[PDB]
């Protein structure tokens, strides 16, 4: 159910300060659970995901389990969707489908013509060349192609068949993006500061915007949208925090 068009993004919660500056975190928005999955960023060394049972046990640093991934991960673009994790295998444009329950990779898919490995990462870098996003429409891949001149390119990706189901060329440069996320098939480009660009895929149309985005700390590592409780899960310079959204 579309929450609406985004009017504003504001900080809500501050969970703790982690010991890693970059990383990412989110929930499975398609599971009715308080499970939190946690992946800190170390370049060339990232191949694990730690699962937490609740929000309070997360802050206490009380993990449920740890998942050893079949491949390394490039950047903080990972995503969890319906009991299955999706991430970018190091030095490749390949997204890995990873079933959490049976603990096996169940598949893989190539994201056509994507620049990768700090060829078109985000502003802060860290192999952010590929960022995954979840919204009301399904599973997406945000990247930059050398044909589209390093500017953000989005594709809709089938989470079960791993087929690319459509593509849109935008006008915002991915090296400029501090991060990004999807809502109702609407792209939200962060600069850090501001959301200063959006792309509405339904119309295959974009528009320049000007919605505030908290500069609480400088190093915005990751920004992932959540359609369940309609929140942002953000990692900004060692800090694990939540942002509330205004519709």
């Amino acid at each position: 159910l579309c929450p609406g068009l985004l009017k504003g993004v504001y900080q809500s919660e501050h969970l703790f300060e982690s010991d890693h500056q970059s990383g990412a975190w989110c929930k499975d928005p398609l599971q009715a659970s308080d499970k939190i999955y946690y992946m800190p960023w170390t370049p060339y060394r990232t191949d694990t995901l730690t699962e937490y049972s609740s929000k309070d046990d997360f802050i206490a640093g009380r993990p449920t389990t740890t998942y050893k991934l079949p491949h390394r991960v490039d950047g903080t673009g990972f995503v969890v969707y319906d009991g299955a994790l999706f991430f970018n295998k190091e030095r490749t444009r390949n997204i890995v489908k990873f079933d959490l329950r049976t603990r096996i990779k169940s598949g893989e898919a190539i994201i056509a013509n994507a620049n990768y490995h700090d060829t078109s990462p985000y502003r802060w870098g860290g192999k952010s060349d590929i960022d995954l996003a979840v919204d009301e429409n399904g599973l997406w891949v945000i990247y930059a192609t050398e044909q589209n001149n390093g500017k953000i390119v989005i594709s809709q990706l089938n989470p079960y068949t791993l087929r690319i189901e459509g593509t849109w060329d935008t006008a915002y440069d991915k090296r400029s993006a501090s991060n990004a996320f999807m809502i109702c098939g609407i792209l939200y480009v962060v600069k850090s500061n501001k959301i200063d660009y959006i792309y509405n895929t339904d119309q295959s149309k974009d528009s320049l915007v000007d919605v505030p985005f908290p500069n609480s700390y400088q190093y915005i590592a990751a920004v992932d949208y959540n359609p369940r409780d309609n929140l942002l899960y953000v990692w900004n310079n060692y800090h694990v925090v939540k942002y509330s959204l205004d519709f």
Binding site: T119, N149, G150
Partner: protein, 321 residues
């Protein structure tokens, strides 16, 4: 100021993914970072004029036709990515063209034991990172720079290790040796002993049949030994490793532990011991007492009885006799 084929933007030259067998000659002198991966570039496609780009600091050349180590590179390159290439010979000449190199990745190449000209690294004195993941190394090179701080030799065929290979690498901090064919006789006497600043030791997925002794405890925080076939643990294996706060030994053939080996693991935090065939005899009673005396801070996993059958699956700290 850029070639027609590639696209340049504020120091960043994008020549990647263009079926390049050869590097363009018309290049911006104010160049900073280069993208040449995913081309067909071999060693002859390197111009001599390329050397004069004194401001280039990072070069990505993975997945090309470099069939050996490249020359005529920007004198002041700090990052080099040569993975997914067909590299074989490595001369002193080749490395000396970039002594101001700091970070080197050679994953997915065809480099072997002797394939490196002896004393090649005697010139690259800025070299701090080294990646030999997935090569064809049968042993470890002797003439490695002291400035080396990390060393990845995962997924090679390493079976034997001489002492003066690793001695002299006091700047070494992390030592990764996954997927190699290492046995206890293949180990040097005090080959790890001199790595004073060593922090991580990862020896996952080898053929070790015992815990290694003579480990440096000066800075060792994390010690990895999973997926091995270890039977014994020598009483002095974990001696003086007092800064060790992590140690993993999952998937081994360990039944029993000798008395009082963890007395020296003062700063331990995490001890994972999964998938081991623990027998609970009078030899195992010392563990139970030690577990109860332990501060609540330290977490331990996989420590449950498989033998005898009567108490199989049962937590060791809970048993009477």
């Amino acid at each position: 100021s850029c070639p027609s084929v590639c696209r340049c933007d504020a120091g960043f030259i994008y020549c990647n993914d263009r079926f390049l067998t050869s590097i363009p000659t018309g290049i911006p002198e104010d160049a900073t970072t280069l993208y040449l991966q995913n081309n067909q570039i071999n060693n002859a496609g390197i111009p001599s004029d390329l050397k004069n780009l004194l401001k280039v600091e990072r070069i990505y050349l993975y997945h090309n036709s470099l069939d050996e180590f490249p020359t005529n590179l920007p004198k002041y390159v700090k990052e080099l990515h040569l993975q997914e290439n067909n590299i074989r010979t490595i001369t002193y000449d080749s490395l000396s063209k970039i002594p101001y190199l700091e970070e080197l990745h050679l994953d997915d190449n065809s480099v072997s034991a002797v394939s490196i000209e002896e004393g090649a690294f005697r010139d690259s004195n800025y070299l701090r990172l080294l990646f030999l993941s997935r090569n064809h190394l049968s042993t470890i090179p002797w003439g490695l720079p002291r400035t080396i701080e990390e060393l990845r030799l995962d997924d090679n065929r390493i079976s034997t290790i001489s002492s003066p290979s690793l001695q002299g690498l006091t700047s070494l901090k992390r030592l990764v040796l996954d997927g190699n064919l290492l046995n206890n006789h293949g180990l040097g006497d005090k080959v790890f002993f001199n790595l004073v600043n060593l922090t991580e030791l990862s020896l996952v997925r080898n053929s070790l049949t015992a815990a290694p002794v003579n480990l440096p405890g000066t800075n060792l925080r994390k010690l990895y030994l999973q997926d091995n076939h270890i039977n014994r643990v020598p009483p002095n294996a974990f001696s003086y490793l007092r800064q060790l706060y992590r140690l993993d030994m999952s998937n081994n053939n360990l039944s029993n532990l000798p008395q009082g080996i963890f007395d020296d693991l003062d700063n331990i935090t995490q001890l994972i011991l999964r998938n081991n065939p623990w027998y609970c005899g009078c030899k195992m009673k010392w563990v139970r007492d030690w577990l109860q005396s332990l501060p609540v801070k330290v977490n331990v996993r996989g420590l449950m009885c498989q033998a005898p059958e009567k108490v199989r699956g049962m937590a060791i700290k809970d048993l009477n006799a």
